[PDB]
Structure 1
């Protein structure tokens, strides 16, 4: 029965618009870094076992690390990794009554949670999914996310290149019915194609856009309206055949309850980097009870939370497919040791104990301690 001894948080800052390297895209008005960055967490136990965790580090990563280093670490040191979920709950209860129930606070918890589960797995010599109810899958279907090219012609080509590599599921970021046609045209009628609509529409607009895409067989519509527009979302889902998909920006199972109450989604798209295993599973288990499909999100990252996501996805009954960030996943290979792969439209669930991946010895060299 080994216990948490030490907790360090880091950034990893890889290169790929204002002074500090921040730009703001103008169809969601959202800020972006012009480089890749995530926050990593290393947790060592008394007997020298090491767990790794990760969360977003795109903007103000020193905030998240502070929360970890100023508050969370002290209430986590001395605890048992096998109480990972109970620990996540106590740490959540620390700040919930002051409205710290999402954003950077839950990010900080995600990173910690993931490493406790990593550590749990290594310590029991099992991959996490075998601590999460069982392994249901060795592989998980993957879909191609975002064609980041200058014109639609140049984007269809890129689609068809990934089709030529054994991928038969695709998402394009709308920010509209033409883009859909050429993608159906170039890719044939067996491939499934989803549209990410990036939040910036009223229910009315989203419905007209969705209805103009349905004649080409729209797989799902993601984020048709703003997060807070629960009414618009429900109105959108009751007005179209097409499955509506949301969840990437949530933090806990509580975020989901209102949306299933209003029967406003067919698909949850949880993002592990934002949630951590405990909450991820809680979202997947809720969706299970309510016959909602799970299609986890993927994003810029070192690949730790990603690995954490595949382990959980392997445990969840309702996981149909998983997002594949090619432009992220490809260059970020060198930074990891382990059997995590994606090829021929399928992620390979890692097998080693824990997450089954670790940052390489050289990736650890690139870390900047907080």
Structure 2
């Protein structure tokens, strides 16, 4: 039956990178279990428009007051209760995704199962930076290919795009290879980007403006490599407009970017209805965010490998007790109810920089 949200903690961790990454956590308490989610907004608006200060104020001043002491049938009812505030989808996601974890746990059921997924493991790839040169690139890719990662994603810019790709492609003609064009291009770069077509990349990710669809649709007409959208799809309706416009053929689905799991399933199903795959993006998450990602990636239209690589790549120590490690490019689903992962409270305390509790 229904669940009452009795309390909420906001806990902000500073996790040293194997300097540091800020991990905002929401813990929701109810019915003798807890749901935990991780914010993917940054202290500064560099990847997208939200910030930690903005989001946390929104949580404590608006979203939490709306739900505390209230009883709900499902996470959809929680989302409905937040109201018609505009944007701020990652802030919303913290509440929505914590509610999914909590709801799943009241039932004793794995999160993926309630979302409609039935995989026991998900395929994963890796994303690498710009290397010094053609050889360095080929060597560092080789390192990850020898780990069995199922897709290699290279950062590119002008004019370091064709070189890395041509090099990597000759060394490895059979690997699945893609680029993150990092919005470093404008329509004026179409001809250069077209030079990548010979190398059979699965896609070129977000080459133009982070908020654009119209120019991407134009660029897609000029080159043969499929475009993948990331930043410009923050909702199921964005996904619809992008795919109808022909702005891309692939979507990088980031769960919090679109406002949480239910909206993510809708994005996933819209892409599928257009015959376009999705794959799971990464935001350098702690094991909380990483576990939410893995559960969502169990859905059938996650047909390309996600950026969901081994936790030990990122952290000398994670915030959860369970390891999240891929082998041979396959990441298993963490077992247990909800996310199947558990905060390591003692370790978390050592890296906490802010903490607060809220009740009705």
TM-score (norm 1): 0.85
Distance in 2 (CA, whole Å) between partners of 1:253 and 1:337 is 34
**Equivalent residues of 2:324, 2:331 under 8 A apart:** yes
Match of 1:181 in 2: 166
- Selected match of 1:358 from 335, 339, 342: 342
**Equivalent residues of 2:310, 2:324 under 8 A apart:** no
**Equivalent residues of 1:147, 1:159 under 8 A apart:** no
Deviations 1:21-70 (A, max 9, x none): xxxxxxxxxxxxx631121101111x331110111242142321111111
Match of 1:14 in 2: 15
Deviations 1:76-117 (A, max 9, x none): 1234464202321331x331xxxx22xxx2111111111111
SS at match of 2:22: strand
**Equivalent residues of 1:340, 1:350 under 8 A apart:** yes
Match of 2:330 in 1: 346
Question: Pairwise mapping of residues 118-197 of structure 1 onto structure 2 (< 5 A)?
Answer: 118-135=101-118, 137-147=119-129, 149-175=131-157, 176-186=161-171, 188-197=172-181
SS at match of 1:341: coil
SS at match of 1:10: strand
SS at match of 1:291: coil
**Equivalent residues of 1:41, 1:115 under 8 A apart:** yes
Match of 1:108 in 2: 91
In structure 2, list runs of 5 or more residues that go unmatched: 44-50
Distance in 2 (CA, whole Å) between partners of 1:115 and 1:327 is 21
1:198 Cα deviation after fit: 1.0
Deviations 1:234-293 (A, max 9, x none): 112222221110034543223223212202211110112323112211111111211110
Instruction: Write 1 or 2 for the structure with the bigger share of helix.
Output: 1
In structure 1, list runs of 5 or more residues that go unmatched: 17-33
Distance in 2 (CA, whole Å) between partners of 1:327 and 1:337 is 12
Distance in 1 (CA, whole Å) between partners of 2:41 and 2:12 is 7
SS at match of 2:115: coil
Question: Pairwise mapping of residues 126-275 of structure 1 onto structure 2 (< 5 A)?
Answer: 126-135=109-118, 137-147=119-129, 149-175=131-157, 176-186=161-171, 188-205=172-189, 207-248=190-231, 250-274=233-257, 275=259
Distance in 2 (CA, whole Å) between partners of 1:324 and 1:148 is 19
**Equivalent residues of 1:128, 1:355 under 8 A apart:** yes
Match of 1:25 in 2: none
* Corresponding position: 1:94 with 2:94: no
TM-align CA RMSD? 2.2
Match of 1:68 in 2: 59
Match of 1:369 in 2: 355
1:133 Cα deviation after fit: 2.1
Deviations 1:286-336 (A, max 9, x none): 112111100111022212122112111102434322113568854165322
* Corresponding position: 1:277 with 2:261: yes
Paired residues in the alignment total: 341
1:153 Cα deviation after fit: 2.5
1:185 Cα deviation after fit: 2.6
TM-score (norm 2): 0.87
Which aligned segments of 4 or more residues in structure 1 are displaced greater than 4 angstroms? 325-329
Distance in 2 (CA, whole Å) between partners of 1:56 and 1:332 is 20
